[PDB]
Amino acid sequence: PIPPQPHPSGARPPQLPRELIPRHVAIVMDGNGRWAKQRGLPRTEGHKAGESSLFDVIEGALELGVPYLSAYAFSTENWKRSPDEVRFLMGFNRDVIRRRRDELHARGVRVRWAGRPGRLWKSVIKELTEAEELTKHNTKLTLQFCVNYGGRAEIADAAAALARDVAAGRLSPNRVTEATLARYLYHPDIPDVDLFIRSSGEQRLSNFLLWQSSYAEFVFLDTLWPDFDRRHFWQACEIYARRD
């Protein structure tokens, strides 16, 4: 695997005991809009900046040795936004995956798409699907790239799939437990969230890896997502460690 490029600031990963480094970090990447309003830029420029944020945080995860990183790329809540914002976000998240696919393959990043095909463009589904196939043998970092995703939707899809196995006689209805339902999540081999980072001031789960975040530590930072990089990730990991 090609090593991560270090930060322009020359900041280095904190020396933490391996036992206190979170195995799975989840990030809600919010404030792309708010950031643009504050700098008199259009909302689209916030999202553009957010691309570099994610890719820096991925470097931070590789440097520190965090093996699972989940990113809330496109929430089903986005369907409530304007047609023009949704058109931009589809085209953007597609173009980001197409542009950065090869960089991720090289650094040993396994891309897992979590979410529903639903009303996504077929071009978005295609890029995500291909990125999954290309990277499916990598093991250095798993990026759970959550596109058209909701935590309730994932649990409902798990219950639906469980229900099909019950109907077909493959599973008894009296053997339906937490562990049973967990087997039917989108990516059951991905473990629980240890650290849930919410970039901005808004102190909410927002329907993200709901089942998986039940016992997670929450870290609420003030940094809008376009100003977020590996140093804010590292700070959140340090806060996590000090909580032991």
Added chain:
Amino acid sequence: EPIPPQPHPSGARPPQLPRELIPRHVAIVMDGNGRWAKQRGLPRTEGHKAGESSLFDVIEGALELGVPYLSAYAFSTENWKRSPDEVRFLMGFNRDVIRRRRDELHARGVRVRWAGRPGRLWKSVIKELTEAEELTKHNTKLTLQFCVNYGGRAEIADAAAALARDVAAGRLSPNRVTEATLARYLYHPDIPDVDLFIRSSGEQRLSNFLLWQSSYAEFVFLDTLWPDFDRRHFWQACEIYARR
């Protein structure tokens, strides 16, 4: 005709908030009983005893302000941090509290709903909870979801299990399983989403409480240890919620 709540000794009055900004459902984790006892050189069990007065004062605060739904995490099934003796005490205690307070609650128009599993709960605990439910079942001023032997994942798994029984019996199609379907099989489907999730102590976690229902909830993390917590802290949390 419900008897009104007793006002606070301090003579503190509920904040004047627009009805639209008062949370419909508040969920509370009651943390710091142990720490509070340690500070006063008392055994951990005395903190829990003190917490009773905290819960009852917060209920008065909910009635004064007009919050119709209040959920309390009285007893988690996963007491993995606690000693066998403290767990044994907490089963008996939550039973004794519901016995001692059911009539006060009946009088103030509080409907008690038990959320949790009969599981390994003593028959005596189930009895007191069940009788409190029956006594109060026509009240409507406040719903107290008293969560005893409860976990968020357990409730979702039990929902999926009940859904699975209906599928096995041919009462329900497995391709008709959606968020709304699964939500009908929760312990109390008529109790709405959590608007405000209050965690009394510094520990910033869901701790597996009303997981499905807290998907879009606002989290408010206070510093107050639970025995020092009363309607004024509840009201502060509702003010923080409104100012959002």
